[PDB]
Design an enzyme around this catalytic site. Sequence first.
Site, mmCIF file in Angstrom:
data_model
loop_
_atom_site.group_PDB
_atom_site.id
_atom_site.type_symbol
_atom_site.label_atom_id
_atom_site.label_comp_id
_atom_site.label_asym_id
_atom_site.label_seq_id
_atom_site.Cartn_x
_atom_site.Cartn_y
_atom_site.Cartn_z
ATOM 1 N N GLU A 9 0.825 -1.202 0.000
ATOM 2 C CA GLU A 9 0.000 0.000 0.000
ATOM 3 C C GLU A 9 0.855 1.246 0.000
ATOM 4 O O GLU A 9 0.424 2.302 -0.459
ATOM 5 C CB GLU A 9 -0.904 0.047 1.241
ATOM 6 C CG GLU A 9 -1.833 -1.116 1.393
ATOM 7 C CD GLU A 9 -2.714 -0.965 2.620
ATOM 8 O OE1 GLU A 9 -2.225 -0.453 3.651
ATOM 9 O OE2 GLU A 9 -3.900 -1.335 2.547
ATOM 10 N N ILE A 37 -3.605 -5.714 17.094
ATOM 11 C CA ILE A 37 -3.831 -5.401 18.507
ATOM 12 C C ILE A 37 -3.566 -6.620 19.376
ATOM 13 O O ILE A 37 -2.811 -6.562 20.357
ATOM 14 C CB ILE A 37 -5.276 -4.918 18.749
ATOM 15 C CG1 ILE A 37 -5.569 -3.696 17.907
ATOM 16 C CG2 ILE A 37 -5.507 -4.582 20.234
ATOM 17 C CD1 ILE A 37 -4.682 -2.575 18.232
#
Lengths: 512, 504
Positions: free
Chosen positions: A292, A362
């Site tokens: 990206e 996370i």
Amino acid sequence: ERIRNVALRSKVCPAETASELIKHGDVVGTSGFTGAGYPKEVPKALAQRMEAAHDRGEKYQISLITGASTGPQLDGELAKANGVYFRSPFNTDATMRNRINAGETEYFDNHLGQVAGRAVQGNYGKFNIALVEATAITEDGGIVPTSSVGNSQTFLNLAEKVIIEVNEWQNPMLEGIHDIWDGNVSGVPTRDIVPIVRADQRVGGPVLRVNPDKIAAIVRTNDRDRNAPFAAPDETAKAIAGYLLDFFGHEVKQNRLPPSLLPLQSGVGNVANAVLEGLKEGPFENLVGYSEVIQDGMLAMLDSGRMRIASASSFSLSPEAAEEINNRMDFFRSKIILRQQDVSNSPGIIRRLGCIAMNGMIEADIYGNVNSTRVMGSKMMNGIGGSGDFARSSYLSIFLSPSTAKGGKISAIVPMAAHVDHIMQDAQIFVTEQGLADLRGLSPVQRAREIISKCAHPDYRPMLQDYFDRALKNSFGKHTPHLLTEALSWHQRFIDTGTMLPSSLEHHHHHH
Amino acid sequence: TERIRNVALRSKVCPAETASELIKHGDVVGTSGFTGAGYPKEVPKALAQRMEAAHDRGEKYQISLITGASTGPQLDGELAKANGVYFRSPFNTDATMRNRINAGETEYFDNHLGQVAGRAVQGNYGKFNIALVEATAITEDGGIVPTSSVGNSQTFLNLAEKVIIEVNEWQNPMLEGIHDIWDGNVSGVPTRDIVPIVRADQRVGGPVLRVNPDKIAAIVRTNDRDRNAPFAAPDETAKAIAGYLLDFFGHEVKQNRLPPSLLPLQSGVGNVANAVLEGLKEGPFENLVGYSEVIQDGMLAMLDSGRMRIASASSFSLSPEAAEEINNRMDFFRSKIILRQQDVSNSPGIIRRLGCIAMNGMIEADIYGNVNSTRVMGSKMMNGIGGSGDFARSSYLSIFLSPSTAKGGKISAIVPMAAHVDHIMQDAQIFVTEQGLADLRGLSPVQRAREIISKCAHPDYRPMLQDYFDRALKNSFGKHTPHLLTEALSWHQRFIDTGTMLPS
């Protein structure tokens, strides 16, 4: 002169005037991806007018659809003004995050590669405005993007009215670095074959296309992108990078990867930076990026020749790297391709090229389901971004994280993830500073034995082992053992006490 | 007519028992078989008997079993009874094997069906020692004609050290021609090939599996039956679900968000799918196209009535009645059906390119529209994710359909939090139950919850769900996706403790 089409010069006006084109209720599509190439002056002016209206009891909010994250001048200013009723697909601004988590801004974090398609399908409604930052406007009215492409071509197609910010801060020699295709990637089915079979392949041209009759305003600007400080690798990141590079080395020696590896996707931040530094020093040659983002560590490898090409939708550079690429844009322009995000994040292309995906998290549970987004299951961090695009489509899906967070008060490996973004099927390799878990060929119980032994922190491993052991004896089924009475109890313990570590004042089965 | 048309290969014919002796303890075995169709039958039975005898003598004897998808009692059943499978992938529906899996006696991983071939080639399951593939026939130049499914058979043949073919006279010789096997690189070493499919009826390959004859270690002549789907008809609940969906399609067409012929359709197997297909058969959408994993009863009706023009799949899942019809008229149906490799039927690139409409079942969804397709109470495997992820994520529209309750009302299909997640919110746009249809497009998680609770949940559970959501909004750690972690999984635990999700 940046506006080389003479007719469009007559549409130049001040930012404040241009912002008046944007009305309460409007759906606004903007440029902007990883803090690069978002509009700056019109959002600031809009925010001022929004605040003024609110002070007089007048409603003034928009729906804001972007490429991905923007910066203080857009997400920040509009969030300060409480001016956004809906936001998609990806935010990293702290004021906007607070509005989202207070329920003041409705939010949905779409897969990045899907956003253009869902916009065309009409999921976000009818686009009233496209607001796009440009380096230049060409003689035939083409719009040269700046430091990202994102969804800008799709927003220009869909919007009723278009506003262009021409930013003289952006380097003129960016013209040529972009590849914008007129093919049907995200339009009405049947879609076109996207014929990319090499990461360095161009299929389009250097400009965004738009009917000049839709351009309602052009604003001359001069302002910098977000450009976050370089996150220097700490010893945790270095250890993670070391385990990963050792793994790559072994895959090559077992002929499961070429010595040039495969096209690489990674992020930004601490760990990614450590990995890129390791690749620069490692035994691998002729590396290729299909990602990206372009980040700092790549310029190094593109300059040395360690990396041959880097494909992305955006720049994600520190101030020092930003100056490095600008002083040498004609060199780097030949080494980098910036693509529409529905192409950089195309599952079909990612699978075809066989990308190696490297993503953060996370938390993961002991079975290797991954939470990328929602702390305690309910509080948004940034969003799923392109992590699902890449994890599911990749040749190898790798997740990397410190084994603990909040100074050791949170375990990144938990009995059950409080929210799932990536299912077990989408995650094969986990790396923490404790070690690397290779989960290929394993059932969930086997995944748990590997994750607990290799990745979990010593402070939490006995608790995890205790949960798993007792689940294996008591769970409803034994294929993916759980104790539903305590699966989410570590998260609740954190909410209640600020730590996942148990106090010796009560019983815990792992102390015994 | 002789099924082995290659004269030379007839010399490799041997008994199933002797063939099973080729399979050694620890072996990785790749087999044909997808939705109860086209799996090997006699060699697994002989293997299972020898495994049991070995175990009785105190000899270890287990294999890793990799398939296309589900098989039948002769394979999954017999081997599970023998305790002969140490690892299984990617999809099982046999009750004996399911019991081994949920007892922890057989290790299981339910891969996305479209990915299995690629992971096999990468080596995730280990080196393939054996490919065991059922055939309708062997052609004069040594091509292997598949039977009622294609599945992963071409990949397993490529990978395996030794090959065992079961030539099954029970299978219809007229299947020859229905398959499309591509020579190109879909699941091999990167960079892969562009797959040139741009229409669901496009054939890009040939009718046979290819294999080096020197790898063929045994050919076994067999005569035994596939499994059949149930005949049983959709009830009022399924018909109601189909009604809401068909009404929704109608409105999409009226709003120009779908063509009058809709888009290529993918449907799972079950009563609800049957109801949807029966609905479409007499529906207002003409020239339909199927691009799915499976051909089921309802499709034959439409391919017959002309309401559906072509159907692409990897396998058959037919009732005895439907099987009789297709076998009586294979001439006709062969021109209307394409059976593809499962890494092509379930290719996310192709699915997105064609703009498929995905329609899948579920065990449960939570109020935010995350979907559990697989694990009851989070831990007990049902069947597996199958191709539902391939299709849900890649589709133009992802729809999930289910009765709003199960077990005579004692389980709610809409829960505060799913006990296991297979499909994240981003992969599910439309939910349909017999209570109504929730269109979640454009919505944040709290907006999704309002729609799912009010449109889809059963009246017995809707007030409980609303109460959970309202108190979560007030007391949750964050308000973006509100939860009460102390009671998020409490309905599941209540079922475990009391046999029902309804309070006393």
